[PDB]
Structures are given as structure tokens and as C-alpha cells.
Structure 1
């Protein structure tokens, strides 16, 4: 079991009710595949530099999970089967690379 980070973008037209309903499903999805949501961060809505699915703005949800490697590339699939879900990108939770000054 390794940690990861799932980034997820959605539609801007959604209402607190729709989003809340999708997340609930994202979350449930994660768990169906040994995922244990450690954190989350609804930084939703930002100014995309390029229209994704023709829309110039998106919801940025970010989940950290300690999944069983063998599944990662599968969730990533089920997360991307939802219309409202525009893009998904899981990554390895890589140490800080403090750097500057």
C-alpha cells in the first residue's frame, strides 16, 4: 500500500447539490478499491488556462489516499466514467522538495 493524490476536475454549472452528489460517489468509488481518504481539499473553481470540455474554468478537488498500488489505474478509470468529471490525475505522494532563496 502506497499513498497517492487524486486530482479531480468537474463542471462549473453544477449546484452545491450536484457536486455534493458526485463527490459522495468519488469517495465511495475510492473505498471500493482499498482507498483510505486521508485528506481532501475543495479548492474548487479556478481560471483554467485552456478550455477543458469547452469550459474555461473548473472545480479542483484533491484527495490523498493510501491505496493498494494494483488498483490506482482502475479508479482513475471509474472516476473518468462520469460526464461531470472532466480530467483525473493520480500521482505518488512525493516528499517535499523545499527549494529557493
Structure 2
């Protein structure tokens, strides 16, 4: 099990009924693929650099997990299925390389 980082951006128009559902869906999808969650960071409404799905904003999520490596490409396939989900970029974790230190 290596350690990865999950970037999820979804439609910034959801109310709490749909926001809780969409996220508890993300919870359900990580349980079924075996991802032990280490910490979470939720940014929310953020100005985008270019339109994505005709929409000028995006609601951002970030999880750091530890999971089996073989199941990663299938985990990405499961998250993109949701219509409200827009960007799913999973990157293997790395050390904080410092510059001008």
C-alpha cells in the first residue's frame, strides 16, 4: 500500500441534500476499494482559471489515503461516473521539495 492524494472538483451549485449525498457517495466508494483515510482538506468555492463545464467556479476536495496500488485506476473509474463530479486527479504522494530554502 502506497500513499496517494485525491483531488475532487464538483459542481458548485449543490444544496446540502445533494452535497451530503455526493460526498457520502465518495465515502462509500473509498470503503469498497480499501482506502484508509489519513487526513482531509476541503477548500470549497474557488475561482477557476478557465471554464469547466460552462461553469466559472469549482468546489474542491482533497484526501490523503493509503490503499493498494493495483486498484487505483479502477477507483478513478468509479468516481468519474457521478455526473456532479468533474475533475478527478490522483497523484502518488511525494516529499515537500524546498526551493530557495
- TM-score, normalising length: structure 1: 0.95
Q: Take 2:85 and 2:66, find their aligned partners in 1: how far apart are those partners?
A: 22
CA RMSD of superposed structures (Å): 1.0
Q: Take 2:82 and 2:93, find their aligned partners in 1: how far apart are those partners?
A: 25
Q: Take 1:82 and 1:100, find their aligned partners in 2: how far apart are those partners?
A: 42
Which consecutive unaligned segments of at least 5 residues does structure 2 have? none
Q: Take 1:63 and 1:17, find their aligned partners in 2: how far apart are those partners?
A: 22
Q: Take 2:41 and 2:19, find their aligned partners in 1: how far apart are those partners?
A: 14
- Work out the number of aligned pairs and report it: 101
Which consecutive unaligned segments of at least 5 residues does structure 1 have? none
Structure 1 equivalent of residue 10 of structure 2 = 10
Runs of 4 or more, structure 1, over 4 Å off, are none
**Does the residue aligned with 2:89 lie in a helix, a strand or coil?**
strand
Structure 2 equivalent of residue 56 of structure 1 = 56
Instruction: Please state how far the C-alpha of 1:18 moved relative to its aligned partner.
Output: 1.2
- TM-score, normalising length: structure 2: 0.95
**Does the residue aligned with 2:56 lie in a helix, a strand or coil?**
coil
Q: Take 2:73 and 2:7, find their aligned partners in 1: how far apart are those partners?
A: 13
